[model samples]
Target: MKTQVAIIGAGPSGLLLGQLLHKAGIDNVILERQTPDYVLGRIRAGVLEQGMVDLLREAGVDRRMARDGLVHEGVEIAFAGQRRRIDLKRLSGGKTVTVYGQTEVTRDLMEAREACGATTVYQAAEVRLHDLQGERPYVTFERDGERLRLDCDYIAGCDGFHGISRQSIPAERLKVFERVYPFGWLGLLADTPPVSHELIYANHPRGFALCSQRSATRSRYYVQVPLSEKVEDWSDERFWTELKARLPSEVAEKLVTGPSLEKSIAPLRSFVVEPMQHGRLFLAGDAAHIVPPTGAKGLNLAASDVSTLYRLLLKAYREGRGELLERYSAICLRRIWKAERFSWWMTSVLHRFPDTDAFSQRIQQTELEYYLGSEAGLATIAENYVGLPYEEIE
Candidate 1:
């Protein structure tokens, strides 16, 4: 097979990139190791930075989202038996985030790709990339026990953190910086209405808790747990009981509990590669960086990576310009690190640690109080929450 760009993943990032390329009159194909149903079934967070919403519109896949997505102007930060709301819109100059599920975003992109007659190969196995630094980069994989090869001008490694895209680069060339948090988030999704209209991030002496939702009828909640804790140990009743313990009394009184639709535990980590590109191969989304869910920056970071690569590739195809292409890694790292910082900060202030000294715990509490009391501090959180403006591509 031959195409201008061979995309290595069918997740939201790759699908978004493929759609953008198609609308730009570029030819590309997407390869996925999982079936369409499997891909769609993977539940992910849906908080949308304004930039992601804008990009979806640019790709012509935001109709359903724009209609169904909920808009929130602020989020509440609860601590010390008190809750303070940060006005994201007012502090961020009228910017707000949209609550839309990643599953829905992927579905819309899949439908758009199908309607446009773009190529997507599902159930691809043993995918490997080769000759990435040479004049031509190619990928080979197995499908139904049959081997296939695809040659393209460039390759997009959107296959995620576990995929072969970043692994293909020599270890010496890729410098990784990572920190694994001591706790994990045990999340539950249920059909009960959310306890609050807007999301809440709570810091309790016990641990951290997050009150979030996917829609009016579907709610999502999380509480910090030991890294060694098992999901099977917690029943629906137990999960709801623990979640309520961390929330304020009034909010907890209003909380509704139900049988969980989904339950899982996710470890928190902040990881990044020094550069996001290698020769003719480039990384986007999870393939390039990862952030803790505390700041809701993971998916948004991926969106920004897609925007950067899309513009660079469009310029390459339209004006034969490769200067921006060479600058991709540097430019992406600039934004990636800032997100890492914010995610790390949020995680530290809100989560209970096993080895936290009394002085350190007091510091965390003081910081939260200071942030809620100061306009500059609130603006910092609000600005990063609504998302910093996308770095301009030269």
Candidate 2:
């Protein structure tokens, strides 16, 4: 209620922010709409940039991850019966990614939150932050059927896209940019082992198929499919068949799928809310933007926002300056749009456009061929892929 920061959502961004602020000796309270179990089990991102890896370590949450995580120096992109390895080590000065799922990262967040003694009003704080323009940005909500008005000086909205923080900003003062793909990711989590030693981003004639890891015993994968297909339409046997058909033959034989604990269609979309702050309220994570799964930048980007805002808040506290706080929108957007471009390029390259003519499709193939052929193209991808420098972004 009354603290230096009132954080909305217990997801990665808000949780990380609370941890950082607590470390700084700044008292903060987090309000979330979901229980810890549900939040920890949400399966989405599995890729972690090196910077994110360091951040997790600094936060005292990387013990389990460091033990079980697999580090990849690069990723393989398969097409035209050939696989092109983007050597991130060479292209980006030995930068790497760890194959740690977002769910595990959630566990880190929850543990860190508890360790910091941060107040969490979860599953009960279906709250709305109001009058953020004033000195007291009040958060009102229901708890055990009782209405309460909680006040704080500043509000951090880490709630995802559908959350109310975005609506709090006056529409006329905002600028919206977005792109929606016709495809959806039909993701499957199976009891099978990994098909490849490293992750595969395969661009086949059918569409895009990606092999990812959950842990040592289980694997997760995604295939681009028509948005209209219902999950009920794909029986267990059919799901495996589709995966085998879409995946490259190099990975086909080892791929064994079963008992999909997670099977659903994730709609592909790219969205960014410009000037990501309104009055005393600042938005972070999915509350501001969304990147399709292709880039694997979603989770990292959200995490980076917490660190960025934390530094800004610290600067404000030290210098007694409101300039950084006032310009938070401009500061976050530089990195957000860079991620936007990267996600778009990655998604278009891998996923097929069903309605497109052969000529247009060939153009995508041509672009891929040209890109894979040149060192410059590879370097450009490598810079973004390995992990762009978060703190010193241009």
Candidate 3:
């Protein structure tokens, strides 16, 4: 196979990159390790930051999202039975987040791209990227029990944390920065009414809890749990009881026992690699960085990366400047690090830290006090919560 760009993974970043580049009259080939059905049905994230929504809409992938997605103006913080709304809309000049899952975004892009005759290879396992410095950047993979080799001008790596792209780079040249939390989120998606108009991040002795919804009739919530705990550890009744104990009492009491659609234990972690690019090969999305789900920044940042990447590749093909291409890693890391800081802040504020001395605990408390006290601090949170500013014009 041959193309202007070869993308590894058909996840949101790779899919959106393909769609955007195709619309720009650039040819690309997408290789995915999973079947199309499996990839489309996988649900990993449910929040869309403001910039992502804009990019999706502009790229013609947000039509269904706009109709089905719920708009949340701000978030509420709950602690000790009290809920304080952040009023992020007012704080950020009308910016609002949405409750559209990554699965749906991928679905939209896959459909839109297929309709436009874009090339996507599903079940592409054992992907190998090589010769990035050569004029012909190449990727080799196996798909459907057949070995395939692709030669392209550029490569976008969107494969997740376990994917091959990041590790393909020499370990000595890459600096790995990450944080692993002992706690994970026991998340449940239930067919129930939401307890609040806005998403609530509640801090309780039981643990950190968050309440978000897809619509008025469908809700999603998560609570801190043992990293190794299974869904069976909490029954339907116990789920509701724990929720009752965690959420602010005034958030609501009328949540009906809707069927628990799905449940999982999501481990909390933050990871990022330096220099997301090496020669003609560029890394985007999960292949480059990861964030704990506390602040819901992971998917949004992935969307941002691909959005910027598509434009840079187009500029390289058109204006022939190649400036954005050269600056991709530096630019992406700036935003990645900022989100890491915010994710760390949100993580520390909500979860427990083992082996912490009294002084460390007091330091955490003091930091929280400062964050919640200053307008500047609140605005910083509001900006990250709303969405970081991102654009494609180079």
Candidate 4:
């Protein structure tokens, strides 16, 4: 098979990229190592930054999101048994985040791709890239007991961190930075009315807890736990009990508990690779970087990458501006670092680190106080929380 672009992985990043490129009349093919059911079964972050919300609309896959996604104008920060609200909409010049599940976004993109008859090869095995530095690049994978080759002008490595995309690049050409937190988030999803109308992020003596929601009736809550903690050890009653202990009294009083629909523990990490592209292969989303979910940047960062690549590819095809391809890593890295900083800061101030001494605890308390007390500090959090504007691809 021959195409303009050979995309690896069918996650939101790859699927969204494929949809955007297809709508612009660019031919592309997607290869996935898992079935569609497996992709949808993976639960992920639910918040969408304003920029991502707009990008989805541009991709023409926002019908259901428009109808069902909840719009949150502000989020509350709970510390020292008190809650302070940061008016994201007011402070960020009316910007707001949409509480839409990442699964729903992926589903929308997948449906849009199918409706448009775009090619997505699921259960593709041993996907490999060839001739990346050459004028033409192609991908090889095994399917149905037959080895297949796909020739393309370029390749998108959206297969995520563990996938072959980044691993294919020579280690000497790439600079990797990573931080693995000592704790993980134990998240529970249930069909109960949220404790608060807006999301609440709490800092308590026990740990960090976030009361987030997917909709008015569907709540997604998380509590920070030791990395050694096991999910099988925490039952619904124990989880709810521990969660309430971390929340403010008033907020916990309003909490409603129910059987959990899903439960899992995810470790926190901040990871980034310099120069997200090499030759004809460009990395997007988790393939290039990862941020702790503290700032809700995982999927939004991926969207920013897709936005950049889509615009740059359009210029390359339409205006013969293929030279602009070199600008991809620079443009993406500028924004990616800013988000990395924000997520790192959020995780630092909110979570109780294992090595946090008494002095550090006091400083952490003051950090929240100083930020929430002043207008400038509040604005800083608000702007980053709503997501900084996507860098213009000029």
* Per-residue lDDT over 115-226 for candidate 3, one digit per residue giving the tens place of the 0 to 100 score: 9998988878889989878777789888767878999888888898888888888788788888889889988888888877788887776788888887778888888887
Clashing pairs in 4: none
Model 1, C-alpha of 134: deviation from truth (Å): 1.4
Name the 10 consecutive residues with the lowest summed lDDT in model 4.
Answer: 351-360
Per-residue lDDT of model 4, residues 84-169, tens digit only: 99999999999999999988998999999999999999999999899999999899999988999999999999998888999999
Model 1, 1-394: lDDT tens digits are 9999999999999999999999999999999999999999878776999999999999999999988999999999999999999999999899999999999999999999999999999999999999988988899999889999999999999998898899999889989999988899999989999999999999998899999999999998999999999999999999988998999999999998999999999999889997888999999999988899998999999999999999999999999997679999888888889888999999999999999789999999999999888999999999999988888988
Report the Cα lDDT for residue 301, model 2: 86
- List lDDT for all candidates, in order: 0.93, 0.83, 0.83, 0.95
Task: Give the winner by lDDT: 1 or 3.
Answer: 1
In model 3, the worst 10-residue window by lDDT is 249-258
> How well does candidate 1 score on lDDT at residue 388?
86
Per-residue lDDT tens digits of candidate 2, residues 1-394?
Answer: 4778888888888887888788877788888888888887788888899888888877777889999888988888888778888898888878888888888888877887886677999875568778878877888888888988778878899889888788888999789989999989988887778887778888888888888887777899888889898988877778778778877676787776678888888999999978888889988999999998787888888877877888788777776776777767776787888888998999988888878888888898998898888999999888898767776422
Off by over 4 Å in 2: none
In the predicted model 2, the residue pairs found to clash are: none
Please report how far candidate 1 places residue 148 from its true position, in Å.
0.8
Deviation of model 1 at 187, angstroms: 0.6
